Amino acid sequence: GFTPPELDPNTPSPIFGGSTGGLLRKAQVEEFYVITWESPKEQIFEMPTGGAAIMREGPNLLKLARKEQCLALGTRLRSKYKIKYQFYRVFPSGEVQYLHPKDGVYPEKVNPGRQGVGVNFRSIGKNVSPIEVKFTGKQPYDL
Amino acid sequence: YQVVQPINGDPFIGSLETPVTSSPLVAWYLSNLPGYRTAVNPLLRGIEVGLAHGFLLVGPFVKAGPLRNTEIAGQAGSLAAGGLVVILSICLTIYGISSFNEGDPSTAPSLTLTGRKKQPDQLQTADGWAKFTGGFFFGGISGVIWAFFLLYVLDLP
Amino acid sequence: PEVKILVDRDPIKTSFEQWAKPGHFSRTIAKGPDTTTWIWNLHADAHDFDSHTSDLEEISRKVFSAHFGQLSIIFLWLSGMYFHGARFSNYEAWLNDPTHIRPSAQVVWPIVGQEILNGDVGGGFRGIQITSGFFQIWRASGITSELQLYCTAIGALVFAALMLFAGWFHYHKAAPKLVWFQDVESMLNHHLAGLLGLGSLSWAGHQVHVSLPINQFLNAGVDPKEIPLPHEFILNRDLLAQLYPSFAEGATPFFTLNWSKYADFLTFRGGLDPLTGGLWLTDIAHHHLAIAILFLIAGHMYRTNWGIGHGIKDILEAHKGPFTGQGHKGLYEILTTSWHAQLSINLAMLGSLTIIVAHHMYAMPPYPYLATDYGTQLSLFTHHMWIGGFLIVGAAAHAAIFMVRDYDPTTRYNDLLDRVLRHRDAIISHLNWVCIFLGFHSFGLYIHNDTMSALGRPQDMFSDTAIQLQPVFAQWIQNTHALAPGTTAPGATTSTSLTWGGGDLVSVGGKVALLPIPLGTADFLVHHIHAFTIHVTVLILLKGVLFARSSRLIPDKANLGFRFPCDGPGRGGTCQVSAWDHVFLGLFWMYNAISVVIFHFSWKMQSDVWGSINDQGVVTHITGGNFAQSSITINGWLRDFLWAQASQVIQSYGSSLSAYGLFFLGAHFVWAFSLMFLFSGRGYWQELIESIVWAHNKLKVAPATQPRALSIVQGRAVGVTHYLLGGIATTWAFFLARIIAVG
Amino acid sequence: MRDLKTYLSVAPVASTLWFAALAGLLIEINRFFPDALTFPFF
Amino acid sequence: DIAGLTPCKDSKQFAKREKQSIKKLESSLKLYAPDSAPALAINATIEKTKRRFDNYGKQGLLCGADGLPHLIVSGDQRHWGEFITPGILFLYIAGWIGWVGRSYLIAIRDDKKPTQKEIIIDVPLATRLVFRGFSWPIAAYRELLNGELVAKDV
Amino acid sequence: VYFDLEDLGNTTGQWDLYGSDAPSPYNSLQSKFFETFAAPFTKRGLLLKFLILGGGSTLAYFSATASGDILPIKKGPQLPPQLGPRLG
Amino acid sequence: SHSVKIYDTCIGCTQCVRACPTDVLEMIPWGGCKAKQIASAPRTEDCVGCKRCESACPTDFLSVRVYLWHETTRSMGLAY
Ligand code: CLA
Ligand code: CLA
Ligand code: CLA
Ligand code: CLA
Ligand code: CLA
Ligand SMILES: CC1=C(C/C=C(\C)CCC[C@H](C)CCC[C@H](C)CCCC(C)C)C(=O)c2ccccc2C1=O
Ligand code: SF4
Ligand code: SF4
Ligand code: SF4
């Protein structure tokens, strides 16, 4: 059992002068992303989009344009610094969707509450020939 | 003291504030162009835009065209500017038909730079866009006619 | 902070043990090959020192000794040129009759039929005509006998040995400490004042004591064997005084500031000597003297051990403003840390310099009998253009390697760099737009002219006879240069260059040297082509640098390295996102730009400059002044330039120029060969190789080093390398056959 | 010494020696028997 | 003769080519003092030219209307020197090279690091093996019969 | 605050940067002039048809009635027809 | 969205998950190998199709497969 931490607005954002690498209309009408982390101090870190920003001591909130930017920055926060991070997807309705770490456990560490998806129980060479799924909507790897 | 700041204070919206972008001269001038008159009927803004542009297009067509050196028809080469007004008005029309449906509301922003709620421009509606296209056509044909009406006492006729 | 000599003793042991361990420098490569890919990596990583080790001191020591190796090779190469000038040249016969004899410094053996390449170059000499220019240098240096060339070749060989020795010595015996390299103020002070200053002064010395007098006897028609030896001018000052009377004073006017009395052999006349067609040697010696003073002064700007002077860090930090923040703060730390940064700036400036040299040497021919030798002049201009362009693309490559490898805002921060990175999208978007605008409004005008000319409407073209696009600004400039002497340069007798000033056509041996170069709509259109091509090259390379770290498509791009093929077919496909692939793409555009530049040079010079002159002064240009009316159209380039001027190289068979015909076709071949690599991909080749490998295992002859197709990156590198070699060598053969036959 | 012979056994060096010998040989053969479209000795 | 050609000894065009070549080299020769070294070189090229055309004429080469040798590769016994005989020589040498290289690869294949001897040649082993190519046709024929030439089930 | 899950238009920068929002600087009588005269062109489908058919027939007109003093293609050849390489 | 599948040749070395730049893959418990874990692709709607996972797999043949399929804003890696 794991309860995703809710996104807390009014969480401070890093010190940064602005860049052309930030959000666009996509964030207004489609979706954007938010990564939060806890920092032990004020540090300089490389922004996945602009140049250099100053991570604030304590909780940090950072809105990014793509999920991959959140995961890249988080990978670095966990690597260069030793910082726990989470990030979420945010729709223009205000709805928030917690994304990562999905279990509260990082996905490279096996966690027992996890259900198999897209797992085929056979060697890859035992997939059927296309002719055997022709005119059916299926793909030989969907089995 | 530094001249460049993030856009509207938010440093993670992808842009910057410069003398080019946010300046009283620039902000006033852009705010006083017809396209940026959000409360005005789009038909009138289309009239102004069409008048300016249609008037402008006459020059290059007449002076650079193929009949330019036959002053008998070279002056009358303004028909080409008229035709370009027709084509552009087609492009506007199909842009609005493609972009806006009958009962959809405006897609323009309904906020101001300072955060207060705004009423969105009707230009970004099907009816508002149709009105802006009709106005651009009328003003454009009219501006071409007005430029062609003046052939006299100009250093480059 | 006390600058001093710092080295370490015996850091690396001189041994053949690692000669026998291929890839010793790399921990992975040293394990030897499991596949053929190993063999390529061994060569691609050999000089990538900062990938071998992370210790800045070791890297700096490798770099230093490597530079010694380079200089050794250069001295061996100069030894070759002087030795061939002494032993296998017609340089004395040419020295007698320069306007007739063709310079030749290579002779081929009669083995397989190739002796036909030993052609009639004059002076009773069979050989290959040389376009390097060494004869005009040696004449300008007062060199007369082959013996002097022998002595120079021996000295050059000795210096090759000394440089090589110093490389081994400073890598294996006395290897400087890292602080020694980072003493930037000392280095700049010694290269400004010591290297450039004392070099220029020494050369001024040789010129006033050797070059000027010996060239006076050459110009006066004296036989070179009868000319006094250069040291006889140093001993008996009466020889010089007869030639140059000022030498009777004993350098007393120098100390008494009577320097105007030296206006005899130190002059500001400018223009060209009408006998030799080269710049006045008095002006040149005076020039090297002035340069010597300027650099000797410039070498005292930086503080070292005596408190006076500048620290460069101070200068940087003081320079900041309301637009750039704290800018320049941090650059001293970057430029004393990253070799790739220094190599980037130095490649940029050295290549740009080489291009400037290319212009200044044609418009101001510095050596005697150089301007009228059109093969040498075309060869020099084209050559230095290529060197410059290559060097600049290199500057982009190493700016990118800095961004990927040495950039760290948490350690060595710079405000200017951060701000640039913070509006890279604006910079690249605007450069993109300018490139499109320039494409349309330079090349699209050519297409306009081709279409109007095909439709029978030459009055609707862009031409000096139709719709004129006059380069009014450049015309005004060259007018101002023409009016400069006596007005804004009262000391200057004539124009700065004969391309400016009207009249004063210079002819040598019936051939013209320089006359005023006209400018019109054709020159306008071509110049905007050059603007266009340069802007697109800059776009590709700068875009490569600024998005090497990251982008909206790939946020973690810097973790993939400087040189990587892609990040896969996803995100729509991400091939060629690496900064390396931006250098790859920019090489093609440097080729395009420089190609159009040298075509513009050959075309314009043969049309409006070079040619023969009548006894009564009627000039016939090699081509009929057809630049103005034929270059304003792409069909005119295809027909009146390529199709016309390629006749020599396709007609060279059966003559001594047939080697240029063979290289014409062969360079076409390697260029087309590159398209196999550039248009395909290694998956196909690896599968095919699977079948070939099957065939070998069938006969027990499959190799242990498993055959592999080239890497994606290597496919690209091979491709661009053969594309560039083929194109450049094709234009090489074309140019040399053309200008050797018709020049 | 052993390491130097090893270095001289490496692929590029052995290749230059081998092809340089082959080139001298073929050159001298074309020097004593030049031209020759055929094997004339039958 | 064959294919409508004529022997080069009987070809007017062939002799016209020899004449025009020699007169060309002599036109170059008129420029230099006869004692000079360029002169001796052009004389050597002239003698080599005469040797060339005289040899092509002697050894029975047929000529086209172009006055140039054409090679008969059909196998006609009058022209084996033009292909079949140099061809057998070639196949002997190429078979030698490939047989020796195969011998080397087989010899090093069970070494502890085979690739090590592929990038650094075992010159003693190579010298031991080079002269196996002298008898490569007997060796390869015997291997083909014995079943040692081709790998089994590949 | 710059992040508010309640107002994302402010949060995502969805503003009218240069929109004036002021009232009409166009005086009336001018406005009513253009409103009554440009009104038939404010139906987008109808305007599309009027532009395609109007401009198309206009084009057909100036093309059908063009004079050789304007187009060489109507003027036709004015020279004696030349003779082909071997043929007519 | 791109399809991503795991095959029971998987040995549970976790390298596909470690390589993934959009967090598509997880490690779930399983009894078929010694590491007692097998990969899984529960979030392929975020899959961009770069095949870093496939570059990371040590199994011969692969035990992750990315079948590039219907493109979306997320699969094209668009920040706009
Ligand atoms: C004279 C004897 C000698 C000996 C035995 C050694 C021994 C050694 N050196 Mg040293 N060194 C020497 C001279 C020598 N060096 C000289 C003269 C220089 C000045 C250039 C250096 C500078 C130097 C540096 C900077 C480094 C070494 C390194 C090394 C070690 C690595 C092994 C190696 O170098 O393989 C190399 C084998 C080669 C055959 C290299 C050939 C390179 C030549 C000079 C290029 C020739 C250019 C060529 C003509 C281009 C035309 C090509 C064309 C035909 C297509 C090794 C123990 C490296 C080290 O420390 O290892 C960690 C290291 O980085 N040496
Ligand atoms: C394949 C069909 C086609 C046709 C029939 C034409 C016809 C014409 N072209 Mg065009 N052109 C074409 C393709 C075509 N072009 C393409 C593909 C390109 C891109 C390379 C161009 C680019 C091109 C250029 C750059 C120019 C022309 C010009 C011309 C005119 C030159 C003759 C003239 O001087 O007349 C008479 C000259 C006049 C100025 C009379 C104007 C004609 C009136 C305005 C017709 C009214 C138009 C109509 C209302 C709207 C049309 C759209 C319609 C479907 C709704 C001529 C009427 C020239 C031109 O138009 O001059 C400005 C010229 O500048 N063409
Ligand atoms: C007046 C003193 C002086 C002079 C003349 C030079 C000259 C040169 N330096 Mg050096 N250098 C100096 C002082 C000097 N340096 C100082 C104070 C520092 C900082 C401590 C450096 C550190 C430095 C580095 C890191 C490098 C150079 C390099 C070079 C060469 C650049 C390429 C070139 O121009 O080739 C032109 C060729 C010539 C002019 C031929 C003449 C060269 C003669 C033989 C050397 C004369 C100066 C020499 C230092 C005297 C010492 C010899 C003695 C100790 C036995 C060049 C020969 C590059 C290099 O090493 O290339 C191998 C390079 O990498 N310099
Ligand atoms: C003094 C200038 C200079 C210096 C010192 C360097 C130094 C370096 N460069 Mg740079 N670069 C330069 C100029 C320079 N470069 C220029 C002018 C360009 C434009 C082409 C580049 C573009 C560039 C790229 C794209 C890359 C580098 C890389 C590197 C590093 C690896 C070098 C290596 O081991 O390759 C080994 C050398 C070879 C394998 C030789 C290859 C043979 C060439 C391709 C053919 C030459 C043809 C020949 C001249 C004509 C035909 C003869 C033939 C028929 C026999 C190294 C530190 C690489 C790197 O990874 O950086 C870390 C890299 O990717 N450079
Ligand atoms: C002749 C071949 C060719 C052509 C036409 C182009 C064209 C272009 N390249 Mg490319 N390139 C080429 C070869 C070519 N390239 C090759 C072989 C490579 C591999 C190394 C590259 C790699 C390359 C890179 C890496 C880049 C470019 C860029 C560009 C653009 C430069 C901006 C510009 O000039 O816009 C204007 C367009 C032109 C000058 C083309 C001709 C325009 C005609 C004359 C106008 C006709 C219009 C007419 C109305 C047509 C309508 C007819 C109707 C029927 C549709 C341009 C469109 C740069 C870029 O993206 O742009 C900034 C860029 O970064 N190229
Ligand atoms: C042709 C081609 C190949 C095949 C080309 C290869 C494998 C080049 C290697 C061929 C050389 C000849 C192998 C070297 C063999 C050794 C030097 C041994 C030679 C023996 C003696 C003669 C020295 C690719 O691998 C490739 C990869 C990616 C994009 C395009 C292409 C591509 O176009
Ligand atoms: S085709 Fe090659 S370069 Fe392109 S994405 Fe695929 S692997 Fe990368
Ligand atoms: S293709 Fe890329 S994004 Fe998709 S699952 Fe594999 S590593 Fe993750
Ligand atoms: S890389 Fe292959 S074996 Fe390893 S966890 Fe992923 S699917 Fe399993």
Curated annotation (Swiss-Prot), chain C:
Entry GO CC = chloroplast thylakoid membrane; photosystem I
Q: Write the record's keywords in alphabetical order, separated by commas.
A: 4Fe-4S, Chlorophyll, Chloroplast, Chromophore, Electron transport, Iron, Iron-sulfur, Magnesium, Membrane, Metal-binding, Oxidoreductase, Photosynthesis, Photosystem I, Plastid, Thylakoid, Transmembrane, Transmembrane helix, Transport
UniProt subcellular location: Plastid, Chloroplast thylakoid membrane
Cite the binding residues for chlorophyll a: M676, Y684
Name where it mostly resides: plastid
- Check the record and name the Pfam families matching this protein: PsaA_PsaB
Looking up SUPFAM superfamilies in the UniProt record yields: Photosystem I subunits PsaA/PsaB
Q: Which GO terms describe its biological process?
A: photosynthesis
Co-factor remark: P700 is a chlorophyll a/chlorophyll a' dimer, A0 is one or more chlorophyll a, A1 is one or both phylloquinones and FX is a shared 4Fe-4S iron-sulfur center.
UniProt topology in membrane: Multi-pass membrane protein
Asked whether the keyword Mitochondrion is assigned, the reply is no
Keyword hit for DNA repair: no
A GO molecular function for this record? magnesium ion binding
Q: Which InterPro entries match?
A: PSI_PsaA, PSI_PsaA/B, PSI_PsaA/B_CS, PSI_PsaA/B_sf
Binding residues annotated for [4Fe-4S] cluster, in chain numbering: C566, C575
Q: Which PANTHER family match?
A: OUTER MEMBRANE PROTEIN, OMPA-RELATED, PHOTOSYSTEM I P700 CHLOROPHYLL A APOPROTEIN A1-RELATED
Designated name of the protein: Photosystem I P700 chlorophyll a apoprotein A1
UniProtKB/Swiss-Prot annotation, chain G:
- Keyword vocabulary terms for this entry: 4Fe-4S, Chloroplast, Electron transport, Iron, Iron-sulfur, Membrane, Metal-binding, Oxidoreductase, Photosynthesis, Photosystem I, Plastid, Repeat, Thylakoid, Transport
> What does the note accompanying the cofactor annotation read?
Binds 2 [4Fe-4S] clusters. Cluster 2 is most probably the spectroscopically characterized electron acceptor FA and cluster 1 is most probably FB.
Tell me which PROSITE patterns the record gives. Answer: 4FE4S_FER_1, 4FE4S_FER_2
Q: Where is the protein situated, by its record's location annotation? A: Plastid, Chloroplast thylakoid membrane
Pfam families, per this entry? Answer: Fer4_21
What the entry lists under InterPro entries is as follows: 4Fe4S_Fe-S-bd, 4Fe4S_Fe_S_CS, PSI_iron-sulfur_center, PSI_PsaC
Can you tell me which residues bind [4Fe-4S] cluster 2?
C20, C47, C50, C53
Which residues make up the binding site for [4Fe-4S] cluster 1?
C10, C13, C16, C57
> Which residues does the UniProt record annotate as the domain 4Fe-4S ferredoxin-type?
1-30, 38-67
Assigned GO CC terms: chloroplast thylakoid membrane; photosystem I
Task: Give the principal location in a single coarse category.
Answer: plastid
Which PANTHER family does the entry link to? PHOTOSYSTEM I IRON-SULFUR CENTER (PTHR24960:SF79), PHOTOSYSTEM I IRON-SULFUR CENTER-RELATED (PTHR24960)
Q: How does it assemble?
A: The eukaryotic PSI reaction center is composed of at least 11 subunits.
**Annotated protein name in UniProt:** Photosystem I iron-sulfur center
Protein's organism: Pisum sativum (Garden pea)
